[PDB]
Design a protein around this ligand. Sequence first.
Ligand SMILES: [Cl-]
Ligand SMILES: [Cl-]
Length: 162
Amino acid sequence: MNIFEMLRIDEGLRLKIYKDTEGYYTIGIGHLLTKSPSLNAAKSELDKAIGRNTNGVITKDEAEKLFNQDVDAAVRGILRNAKLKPVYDSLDAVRRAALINMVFQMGETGVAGFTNSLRMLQQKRWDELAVNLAKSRWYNQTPNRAKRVITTFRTGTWDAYK
Ligand SMILES: [Cl-]
Ligand SMILES: [Cl-]
C-alpha cells in the first residue's frame, strides 16, 4: 500500500464530470474542478486543466496525470506550511500518508486548522487523536472514509485499507 493506492480507493475513478459528496464538479480521481454551480464553468476549468477540448470527458491516462499533480501539490503544500510541516516531519511513513490524504481531501488550510488534533499528532497520543478527529463535520459527512483515515492514524498500519 502507498498514498496513490490509498487515495484511489478513497476517491474512486470517474472519467466524466460528476458531482462530489458536497455537490461540486469533479472528475478523475477526486480532482475538484470548481465550486461554482455551473457546468459550463466546470467544462472550462476542465479544458484548461487538460489542455484540450474535452467535452467533459477524459481518458484514464489524463485522469492519472491530474492525480499525480494533485498528490505532488498536497505534499508540497504540507511542506510549505508552517503548521503542517513539523507534524509531518514528526510522523512515520504510514501516518504521513494519512495526513496527505486529509490534505488532499480538504486542502492545506482546512487541516492546518485542526489545532488540537495537530498537537495530539505531534505528541503521538494516538487514541485521543482518534476521538478528537471524530468530532468534526468531516467525520459526520464522510464517515466511512474518515474512519479509514482515523484508524490509519490510530494504528499506524494499512489495515483499514487491506
Ligand atoms: Cl489543474
Ligand atoms: Cl464515506
